[PDB]
Design a protein around this ligand. Sequence first.
Ligand SMILES: CC(C)Oc1cc(C(=O)N2CCN(C)CC2)ccc1NC(=O)c1csc(-c2cccc(NC(=O)Nc3ccccc3)c2)n1
Length: 298
Amino acid sequence: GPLHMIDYKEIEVEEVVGRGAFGVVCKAKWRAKDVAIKQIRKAFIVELRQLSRVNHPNIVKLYGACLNPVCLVMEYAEGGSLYNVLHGAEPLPYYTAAHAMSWCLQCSQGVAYLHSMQPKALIHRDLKPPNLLLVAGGTVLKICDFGTACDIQTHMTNNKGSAAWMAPEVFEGSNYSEKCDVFSWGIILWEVITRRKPFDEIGGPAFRIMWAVHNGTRPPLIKNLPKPIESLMTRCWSKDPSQRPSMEEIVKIMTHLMRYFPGADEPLQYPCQHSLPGRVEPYVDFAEFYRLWSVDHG
Ligand SMILES: CC(C)Oc1cc(C(=O)N2CCN(C)CC2)ccc1NC(=O)c1csc(-c2cccc(NC(=O)Nc3ccccc3)c2)n1
């Protein structure tokens, strides 16, 4: 994995866009290109090595590192976090079923890559919309890993944590595999389809959500959701990791559903005035899906 050595003189820092845990992410410029830089010593060696080994369109690009001061240099995500597109400050952008399905397809392709690496696979173990970034007018999605928490107080048991998207076996303290990322992906699918924060009904501190998920609570089912999308979604939620699909299988299934979801290449340009009403209604609209389905199967 080749990598550019960067003299800190060449960087011109523009703004700060994330301060949590083990560094401060910042917008900057470098040889024309807009870049994102994370300033910090220990695990940096492992991350820098991993972040150079990866080469996939749906995982964020590493241009290189500056060894003094010790910081990563990567492509800037103009579109920002998916979380911020979904639930950020107003005005939030309008999006479609096709966008929602494409973002989950793209995320799954990135994760399938991570799980297929050799000799050992990379397990992300922290997939959630804050670590999913958007580019190309919101059309393209790239996985990253900010790693938002460490201290139990002002991180892991709060809104800057990740218990809503976490697999039971991880927070349970049991052994886990790459199937933990499949659970997370299942939750993200529900999230983009509904534009609801998962387990916002429960809330409180994170241990309340962990308690509910450990007993078997899942996000509510979605009204009028196609059965194949509901099958794939609810399988990823499975308590037993053995019953969850592989990311390889998800990529195949999703790749073929996109036939019934044209228009994902349309960039995010229209505004939205979003307000929230057993089951729950989707934000996106599945009417054209059923229409195109009927034509193929009829
Ligand atoms: C809050 C941040 C996250 O996410 C961002 C949020 C915004 C944002 O919300 N803004 C607010 C201001 N407005 C004006 C624009 C929108 C902007 C940029 C980034 N970040 C990035 O562009 C970026 C690119 S790489 C990266 C990053 C940051 C920290 C760590 C890593 N590391 C990895 O990706 N590691 C890794 C990935 C896969 C496998 C192994 C390691 C990347 N961040």
